[PDB]
Design a protein around this ligand. Structure first.
Ligand SMILES: Nc1ncnc2c1ncn2[C@@H]1O[C@H](COP(=O)(O)OP(=O)(O)O)[C@@H](O)[C@H]1O
Ligand code: ALF
Ligand SMILES: [Ca+2]
Ligand SMILES: [Ca+2]
Ligand SMILES: [K+]
Ligand SMILES: [Mg+2]
Ligand SMILES: [Mg+2]
Length: 994
């Protein structure tokens, strides 16, 4: 606990009784835990109140049905309806379907959040600290850090706790603290005291807040506060939902449901108009109000029917369900649209180092100069065993193990690697493995030096903890590190200014030690070290040096190379201005070349596969990396971006080559090229922008801070679990797995959600069109009514519920990942599908009217009215326009009506079976692909039998239907709807378009 940023570095140190370079003792940590608790926020809890999630009423179309239930509650309250109790059923036939869908949505949401919180909580967040028990920085669960330990944080890192900056290791420290202050651009810090106890966070320029991100630099601090006392910890409970509006496809279907409300309204008012000619008929006693309320009831019931009340839930669900599956593949979705968007992605740009490759770097080859004599130049090459970051392995020259201290050239090589390095190693006592701290490239150097052991230091007798940095530390004693010129990607190198260590001999020379991408560094060398000697750089030498790099980079190990050099006579520090990062390169000139290291960095197993799948899915994959063009192309081949032999001249480019081109041609290069190399963070962004200028959906994959811009710019930003917090922050998705395959899976899933949405819509429209076709085909053709207000509410309850919501659990179509991506601006409803909705809608409307007619005319229990309906309904009371005045009222017979209602349900349930797949056959995609659907259907059929045969019920609705033969008819009329769509799918398949 420390109230102050306004006290000096010293004061804070003294406050906790801590040696700045060593950090807390075990016993100091034991106390501070007890006195302050773990560094975490208890919260973790309650993201939605059981109630909250229930209130996914409030939606577009659900509020309509909600209203509809009130009028039925009020029309019932005035003693009537048409029958007395039949009016108190009405409201529950409407609420029921609503409750059902609500239950499922709520369930899927709860399951999703659980699954997500399982994934997020899985891998523990780690911090880096100096503590007294270990000389080198060590990594602990952030949870364990307490006020008063020395914390190290560098570029990319999430600040783990609220920290008072003690010492800035780079020329600058830049923090992205948007999450706290809203401050959108990164901001500069210093280590000087900020006197005002009052001062706002923005003015605490010597502090670093838990949850912010280091955008540039490296720093050392002492922790002031942790857990709930944390500046961000105080404010959590609060905010008006920095939470959010719905997803593009959600807004699309919403707009589609808005204008389906239009059309249904019209057909509804139309029912009420097309009738009310029947608003004087004997049935409601001819009153000049009664049958206007009745046909108003027919309208409303028809609206509730036609309306897809479950559309808002089924999207919500397919979404939550998509998330739940992504979480099961260890992918964290930070932003809902990510799966649907990724669904129609035509291009996946991707970083290389740590993203496409494993980022488990090992130095396996290195060389220095051996002989230089005129046009002859020769190198001492070396091999290094050990693939891992473990200091165990040996240097080989000519298959024989050497003692690197034998070669002065290697002594300097080791010296630079050690000194020009912001990273180190830590040995995990539990996992029992040597882990990097800071960047892999840099750490590889660290582990290299330990292997080279150039001062023959005695290490056989050291713990695995001590052995980690021993040889490095030895070098650190040999030279004092005045300051460092942080690595920056423009010059593609990094520097370190040093003076000799004891101050034993003042002015025997300061040095700068340099490491960097070989082409730039070698260009800034005028000399070439030969052992302890120096000689002028020359063409033949450069050509030699470079060719062996080309060799290693392009070879079968595809080595990642770094050149190392010393500046023998640096500027005086006084002539050096550190404020301006753009002078660092000139400072790094007049160099002496020492040598080269080549690094092994294997491509991930899963990658080549995923790329193949993208090809098939019509998706492009571009590599975009700061690394050398040689090695980047070599790796593309190894990954399958390029085949092992292809002129690539026209479709791999460096940054320079790319910038050399005119804008027009840059844009076009992006369309054919798959490999961009030696490229800055601005370029990654620009390339993505270019792709986006073909109105395509672009995804960026990456691990590093140099990916954030592109990660942000892209439609979907996918960050590695292993990578930086800043890359993760700029992302919509995070592979905690680091498993590239999930990207493809995620594509497939977004594709499937779309297709599931489609099938739902097809199912409802076509079916509910038939329900409407039906009522208008009677009223026009001039028949007795086929259904009543509650009978309409019944087909609705039982066709528009779980059989529909179920489609959302349809499996992926069989060819889903074999057609190219959908353009995002495609007509939601295809002209051709609109037709298919009508074909089906028409058969359904006609099959249900034809059913009641068949009861009347052809049926043996029905009166034998024979063809021509006997031509009207006029008959009325006893024996009229005497046209076989044989039977009196048979109209109002429940039999014809309950016939139709049973064809409607049965047939609707049939073309749900067509809605397992857009254009696939029940022969290839059978009904048992979706069991959930089949259950729902039984539940409906089941519910529909109940209503018919449990003896109070049929009165509330209508008389039952002769099991044995009437059903055989219902089924005979309804089954063909399947045969119809299945020809219609045959059309769209065996002719094709989309
Ligand atoms: N810490 C460092 N110090 C000096 N040079 C580096 C360092 N890290 C990387 N480099 C060099 O700078 C280049 C640019 O790195 P970057 O832009 O991050 O792309 P990538 O890491 O994928 O190569 C690398 O290819 C490597 O040659
Ligand atoms: F890991 Al890279 F460019 F390939 F930063
Ligand atoms: Ca409905
Ligand atoms: Ca329906
Ligand atoms: K983005
Ligand atoms: Mg990377
Ligand atoms: Mg990198």
């Amino acid at each position: 606990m420390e109230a102050a940023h306004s006290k000096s570095t010293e004061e804070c140190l003294a406050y906790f009784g801590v040696s700045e370079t060593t950090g807390l003792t075990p016993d100091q940590v034991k106390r501070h835990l007890e006195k302050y608790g773990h560094n975490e926020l208890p919260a973790e809890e309650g993201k939605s109140l059981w109630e909250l999630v229930i209130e996914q009423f409030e939606d577009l179309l659900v509020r309509i049905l909600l209203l509809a239930a009130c009028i039925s509650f009020v029309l019932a309250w005035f003693e009537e309806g048409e029958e007395t109790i039949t009016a108190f059923v009405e409201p529950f036939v409407i609420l029921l379907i609503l409750i059902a869908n609500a239950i499922v949505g709520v369930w899927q949401e709860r399951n999703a959040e659980n699954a997500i919180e399982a994934l997020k909580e899985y891998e523990p967040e780690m911090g880096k600290v100096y503590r007294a028990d270990r000389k080198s920085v060590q990594r602990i669960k952030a949870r364990d850090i307490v006020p008063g330990d020395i914390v190290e944080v560098a570029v990319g890192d999430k600040v783990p706790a609220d920290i008072r900056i003690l010492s800035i290791k780079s020329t600058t420290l830049r923090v992205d603290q948007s999450i706290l202050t809203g401050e959108s651009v990164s901001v500069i810090k210093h280590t000087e005291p900020v006197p005002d106890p009052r001062a706002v966070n923005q003015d605490k320029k010597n502090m670093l807040f838990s949850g912010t991100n280091i955008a540039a630099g490296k720093a050392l601090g002492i922790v002031a506060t942790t857990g709930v006392s944390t500046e961000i910890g105080k404010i959590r409970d609060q905010m008006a939902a920095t939470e959010q509006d719905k997803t593009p496809l959600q807004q699309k279907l919403d707009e589609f449901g808005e204008q389906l409300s239009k059309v249904i309204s019209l057909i509804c008012v139309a029912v009420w108009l097309i009738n009310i000619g029947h608003f004087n008929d004997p049935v409601h006693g001819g009153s000049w109000i009664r049958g206007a309320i009745y046909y108003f009831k027919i309208a409303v019931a028809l609206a509730v029917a036609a309306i897809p009340e479950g559309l808002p839930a089924v999207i919500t669900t397919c979404l939550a369900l998509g998330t739940r599956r992504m979480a099961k593949k260890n992918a964290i979705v930070r932003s809902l649209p990510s799966v649907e968007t990724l669904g129609c992605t035509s291009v996946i740009c991707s970083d290389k180092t740590g993203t496409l490759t494993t980022n488990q770097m090992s130095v396996c080859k290195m060389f220095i100069i051996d002989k230089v004599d005129g046009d002859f130049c020769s190198l001492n090459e070396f091999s290094i065993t050990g693939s891992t970051y473990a200091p165990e392995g040996e240097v080989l020259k000519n298959d024989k193990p050497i003692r690197s201290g034998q070669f002065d050239g290697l002594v300097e090589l080791a010296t630079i690697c050690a000194l020009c390095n912001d990273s180190s190693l830590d040995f995990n006592e539990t996992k029992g493995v040597y882990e990097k701290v800071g960047e892999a490239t840099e750490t590889a150097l660290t582990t290299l030096v330990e292997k080279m052991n150039v001062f023959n230091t005695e290490v056989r007798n050291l713990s695995k903890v001590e052995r980690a940095n021993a040889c490095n530390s030895v070098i650190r004693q040999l030279m004092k590190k005045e300051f460092t010129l942080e690595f920056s990607r423009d010059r593609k190198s990094m520097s370190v200014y040093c003076s000799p260590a004891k101050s034993s001999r003042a002015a025997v020379g300061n040095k700068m030690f340099v490491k960097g991408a070989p082409e730039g560094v070698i260009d800034r060398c005028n000399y070439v070290r030969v052992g302890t000697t120096r000689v002028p750089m020359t063409g033949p030498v450069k050509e030699k040096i470079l060719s062996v790099i080309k060799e290693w980079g392009t070879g079968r190990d595809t080595l990642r190379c770094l050149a190392l050099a010393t500046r023998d006579t640096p500027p005086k520090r006084e002539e050096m201005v550190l404020d301006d990062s753009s002078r660092f390169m000139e400072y790094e000139t007049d160099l002496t070349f020492v040598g080269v290291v080549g690094m092994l960095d294997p491509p991930r197993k899963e990658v080549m596969g995923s790329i193949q799948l993208c090809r098939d899915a019509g998706i492009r994959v571009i590599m975009i990396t700061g690394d050398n063009k040689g090695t980047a192309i070599a790796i593309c081949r190894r990954i399958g971006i390029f085949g092992e032999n292809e002129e690539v001249a026209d479709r791999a480019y460096t940054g320079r080559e790319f910038d050399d081109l005119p804008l027009a041609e840059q844009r076009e290069a992006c369309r054919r090229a798959c490999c961009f190399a030696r490229v800055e963070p601005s370029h990654k962004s620009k390339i993505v922008e270019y792709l986006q200028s073909y109105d395509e959906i672009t995804a960026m994959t990456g691990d590093g801070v140099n990916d954030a811009p592109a990660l942000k710019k892209a439609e979907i930003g996918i960050a590695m679990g292993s990578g930086t917090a800043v890359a993760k922050t700029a992302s919509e998705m995070v592979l905690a797995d680091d498993n590239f395959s999930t990207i493809v899976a995620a594509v497939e899933e977004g594709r499937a959600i779309y297709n599931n949405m489609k099938q739902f819509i097809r199912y409802l429209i076509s079916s509910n069109v038939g329900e409407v076709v039906c009522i208008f085909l009677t009223a026009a053709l001039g028949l007795p009514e086929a259904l009543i207000p509650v009978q309409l509410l019944w087909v609705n309850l039982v066709t528009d519920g779980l059989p529909a919501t179920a489609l959302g659990f349809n499996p992926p179509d069989l060819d889903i990942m074999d057609r190219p991506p959908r353009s995002p601006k495609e007509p939601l409803i295809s002209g051709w599908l609109f037709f298919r909705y009508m074909a089906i809608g028409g058969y359904v409307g006609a099959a249900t009217v034809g059913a009641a007619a068949w009861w009347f005319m052809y049926a043996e229990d029905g009166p034998g009215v024979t063809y021509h309906q006997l031509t009207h309904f006029m008959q009325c009371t006893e024996d009229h326009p005497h046209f076989e005045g044989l039977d009196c009222e048979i109209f109002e017979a429940p039999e014809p009506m309950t016939m139709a209602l049973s064809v409607l349900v049965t047939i609707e349930m049939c073309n749900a079976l067509n809605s397992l797949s857009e254009n696939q056959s029940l022969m290839r995609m059978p009904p048992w692909v979706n069991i959930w659907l089949l259950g729902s259907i039984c539940l409906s059929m089941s519910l529909h039998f109940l209503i018919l045969y449990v003896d109070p019920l049929p009165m509330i609705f209508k008389l039952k239907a002769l099991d044995l033969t009437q059903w055989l008819m219902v089924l005979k009329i309804s089954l063909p709807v399947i045969g119809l769509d299945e020809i219609l799918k045959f059309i769209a398949r065996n002719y094709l378009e989309g």
